[PDB]
């Protein structure tokens, strides 16, 4: 049946997948030895005597994040051949990952991806979990995605990026390789759901009351996001949304496909029993400006299309009532070429909770993924940031060293300059 | 794999590196005979970075103990943790460098460089791939700077794509033993500025007084200076040998700090550091530990950053900590010290999270900081150079072994180039 | 007592018992990573791998009884 091959690159993608593959194991109950003490055939492949194996290929040019998951608790679940590892790290550098150190690993990664894409009937999408903030995530991510474009042309290729957040930036060369990776994100990707660190920083303090979370707590939120997105494929419910129609209701033009996300019932169990999480309450908490997991005020730019993934015990009629609540609100603006602007899905099993996590039990959640014109100033803020270092050409000798003919910075300059220029061209 | 070949340059680098192999051995739980304990297999799981299997269960350091006089080689093997090195790793010079750049770089460098390059060739080519070579040395002495940086020239021309990481000490402003200081420091900089990828400096007078007013220790010897540098010795390479949340490499440290390939001379600092009476009375968390590490009071390089600008900074945190109060504090210290950092670089600094702390601590940092405040030594050793250079003095001890007037005005013009690059980038 | 009350400042308190250093009590009993901090329960890290009772050629567990 259906399957979605997940490809994680970079330590951010690996640690995100350590939480996503964590949570898929407990949704349809599957123990770390593969065994269960037809719904598992969306992220697992049964082989032998109950040995369910995930559909993932780990990727990093350094042996530190993936050797550590070999010795962890998933030595047996993650079968030890698709955990592809290298030796020299790409070192926050696009000219390393997309070039000299990295062709040795694209060859073996494409082999195991081809084995995983031709062992189950009718593959449905490629969920890539990359990190445009550094080395192996952006460099090997760009080279690998450029080879999947010709190897599978008709293919849906959802991404999940960690764009450099405005004030938080843990590496100084993030503005270069973020602009340099827009060439891999503008014409080689169908769905470009946008995440960044400091918005999931704020989403946990004021809602889950942890003033010092960690990247584990961040990746639990991202795991909730993609679990709701792929809940309709895996599970059953009224008015399903497939990956095939996911981008059909969010991508108006072939170039503008950069979406956002918001969850909704992100409450620790203390102040979760004290509020009645109604359909209208969670969808307006979803459309709240502070609930975006990106620095994007969704009020300087008009919305174009929404994709509201309801799941749990929700009736398909009060969803229409709460959507009508959002439509009449003047704080949630729309643009004039969409009298309808919602495609909503509904699952039936509740949004799961991880035992030992920061969330609680709710049988409802709105993981709305929206394509708005307000994603443009996320990119345009990086435009002013990129120009201030490129003016007198610092941190460039490395790029010019291992590749990067001087002019790839200029074509990535105009590629991202043409990117937001489309955005205010669309919405007038 | 991921291995770093270590070089014990000079006797100054010998005493510094002896306590370096002290801190790495007990961080990896290593018996001085060569074996292991420590209840945590994570120490063995990355042991190849600094060690080799001795085909008997023993582990030996990948160090090259090198000098032109065997008196200090006797003291290293007589001291604790001295039997770890195999005897073939030591190389001996007999006549002794006379605190003299010509005596090391030219005359008896010819009879020892052919030996030490054989030892480092049998060490570096024992693996399929490596990152680079770290060197502990001095710029005050002749065998620590002359034939020390002479090895830097040869190792670069055979390894042109491998990282160089030079732990180096500098002459002091207020005190100067071994009277010919600037003629040793300057002529080694002329090769250390292009044959070394990452140079990072130590002042033993800055280590004398860090032991004074932040550690509160009454009588400072040199052995307490060695271990204090030795904490930041381990902290810069700790993320290679240990897993972490933000894994970092010395190539990460290179790619993220130096803007322009000429200027790579960085500052090194360590935290936490308190006296016996002040150990109990201080908090231990990120937002309190960063205020100490962003001080001139604890900086092991005595170039006052308040009259300079941080072109780039970096803090490799260690220990199991949350990371939001790490990097929100990184922008917090940048917003508060807005003029102290450079303006054309938004979010100047790196933050790294390593997962294993140094033993006996919940957390610690090392601070690699590219600062233009370091130019105050590069004008101090330049106008002290031209003091003796104008009066032609103490230089007949050099010309008789291969000098000329050309390379001395070239050496002066090299710091005149590097200082002018520093001040023009403000 | 064994000197914890007055803010014990030395971790030499755990080195009298491993005086021969090999007695299998100081041999590999903890792992200190954030992955065990976050994603780890009772015993699913230290478990052996079952391959076959028939050797290297045995790709599974089988026999003439089946």
């Amino acid at each position: 049946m259906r399957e979605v091959i997940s490809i994680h690159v970079g330590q951010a993608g690996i640690q995100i997948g350590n939480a996503c593959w964590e949570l898929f194991c407990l949704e349809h109950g599957i123990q770390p030895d593969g065994q269960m003490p037809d719904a598992f055939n969306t992220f697992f492949s049964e082989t032998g005597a109950g040995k369910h194996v995930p559909r993932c290929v780990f990727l990093d040019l350094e042996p530190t994040v993936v050797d550590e998951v070999r010795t962890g608790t998933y030595r047996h679940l993650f079968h030890p051949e698709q955990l592809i590892s290298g030796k020299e790290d790409a070192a926050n550098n696009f000219a390393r990952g997309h070039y000299t150190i990295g062709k040795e690993i694209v060859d073996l990664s494409l082999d195991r991806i081809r084995k995983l894409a031709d062992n189950c009937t009718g593959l449905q999408g490629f969920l890539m979990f990359n990190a445009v903030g550094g080395g192996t995530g952006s460099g090997l991510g760009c080279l690998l995605l450029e080879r999947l474009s010709v190897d599978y042309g008709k293919k849906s290729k959802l991404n999940f990026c960690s764009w450099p957040s405005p004030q938080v930036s843990t590496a100084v060369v993030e503005p270069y390789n973020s602009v340099l990776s827009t060439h891999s994100l503008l014409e080689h990707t169908d769905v470009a759901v946008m995440l960044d660190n400091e918005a999931i920083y704020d989403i946990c303090r004021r809602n889950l009351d942890i003033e010092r979370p960690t990247y584990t707590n961040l990746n639990r939120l991202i795991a909730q996001v993609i679990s709701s997105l792929t809940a309709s494929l895996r599970f059953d419910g009224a008015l399903n949304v497939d990956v095939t129609e996911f981008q059909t209701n969010l991508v108006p033009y072939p170039r503008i496909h950069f979406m956002l996300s918001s969850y909704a019932p992100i409450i620790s169990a203390e102040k979760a029993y004290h509020e009645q999480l109604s359909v209208a309450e969670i969808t307006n908490s979803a459309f709240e400006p502070a609930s975006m997991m990106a620095k994007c005020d969704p009020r300087h730019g008009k919305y174009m299309a929404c994709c509201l993934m309801y799941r749990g015990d929700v009736v398909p009629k009060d969803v229409n009532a709460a959507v009508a609540t959002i439509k009449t609100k003047r704080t949630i603006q729309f643009v004039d070429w969409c009298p309808t602007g919602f495609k909503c899905g509904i699952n039936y099993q509740p949004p799961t909770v991880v035992p030992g996590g920061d969330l609680a039990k709710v049988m409802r959640a709105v993981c709305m993924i929206s394509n708005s014109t307000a994603i443009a100033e996320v990119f345009s803020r990086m435009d002013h940031k990129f120009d201030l270092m490129y003016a007198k050409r610092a941190f460039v000798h490395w790029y010019v060293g291992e590749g990067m003919e001087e002019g790839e910075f200029s074509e990535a300059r105009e590629d991202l300059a043409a990117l937001e220029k489309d955005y205010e061209e669309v919405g007038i | 794999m991921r291995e770093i070949v270590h070089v014990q340059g000079g006797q100054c680098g010998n005493q510094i590196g002896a306590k370096f192999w002290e801190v790495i051995s007990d961080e990896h739980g290593i018996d001085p005979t060569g074996t292991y304990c420590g209840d945590s297999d994570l120490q063995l799981e990355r042991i190849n970075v600094f060690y080799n299997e001795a085909t008997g269960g023993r582990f030996v350091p990948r160090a090259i103990l090198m000098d032109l006089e065997p008196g200090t080689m006797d003291s290293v093997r007589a001291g604790p943790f001295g039997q770890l090195f195999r005897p073939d790793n030591f190389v001996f010079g007999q006549t002794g460098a006379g605190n003299n750049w010509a005596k090391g770089h030219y005359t008896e460098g010819a009879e020892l460089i052919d030996s030490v390059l054989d030892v480092v060739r049998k060490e570096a080519e024992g693996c399929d791939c490596l990152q680079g070579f770290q060197i502990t040395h001095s710029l005050g002495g002749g065998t620590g700077s002359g034939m020390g940086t002479l090895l830097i020239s040869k190792v670069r021309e055979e390894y042109p794509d491998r990282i160089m990481e030079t732990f180096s000490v500098f002459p002091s402003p207020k005190v100067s033993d071994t009277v010919v200081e600037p003629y040793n420091a300057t002529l080694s900089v002329h090769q250390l500025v292009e044959n070394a990828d990452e140079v990072q400096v130590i002042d033993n007078e800055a280590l004398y007084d860090i032991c004074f007013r932040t550690l509160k220790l009454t009588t400072p010897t040199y052995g307490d200076l060695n271990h204090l540098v030795s904490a930041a010795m381990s902290g810069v390479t700790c993320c290679l040998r240990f897993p972490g949340q933000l894994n970092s490499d010395l190539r990460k440290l290179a790619v993220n700090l130096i803007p322009f390939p000429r200027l790579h001379f960085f500052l090194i600092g360590f935290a936490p550091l308190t006296s016996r009476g002040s150990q109990q009375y201080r908090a231990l968390s990120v937002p309190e530990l960063t205020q100490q590490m962003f001080d001139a009071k604890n900086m092991m390089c005595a170039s006052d950053p308040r009259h300079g600008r941080y072109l780039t900074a970096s803090a490799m945190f260690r220990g199991r900590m949350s990371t939001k109060e790490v990097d929100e504090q990184m922008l917090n210290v940048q917003n508060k010290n807005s003029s102290y950092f450079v303006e054309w670089i938004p979010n100047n600094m790196k933050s790294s999270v390593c997962d294993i702390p140094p033993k006996g601590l919940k957390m610690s940092v090392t601070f690699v900081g590219n600062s233009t405040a370091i130019q105050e030594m590069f004008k101090r050793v330049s106008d002290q150079f031209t003091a003796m250079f104008r009066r032609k003095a103490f230089l007949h001890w050099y010309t008789g072994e291969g000098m000329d007037e050309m390379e001395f005005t070239e050496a002066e013009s090299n710091m005149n180039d590097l200082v002018s690059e520093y001040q023009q980038y403000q | 007592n064994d000197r914890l009350d007055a803010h014990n400042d030395q971790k030499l308190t755990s080195w009298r018992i491993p005086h021969p250093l090999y007695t299998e009590l100081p041999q590999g009993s903890k792992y200190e990573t954030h992955y065990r901090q976050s994603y780890d329960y009772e015993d699913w890290a230290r478990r052996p791998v079952r391959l076959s009772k028939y050797g290297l050629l045995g790709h599974d567990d089988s026999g003439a009884e089946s």
Partner: peptide
Amino acid sequence: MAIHVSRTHREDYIRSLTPRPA
């Protein structure tokens, strides 16, 4: 070529753990 014990991440160590313990 340098060969260490089976408890070190070096070359194929997952195939060097089960047949011979070290």
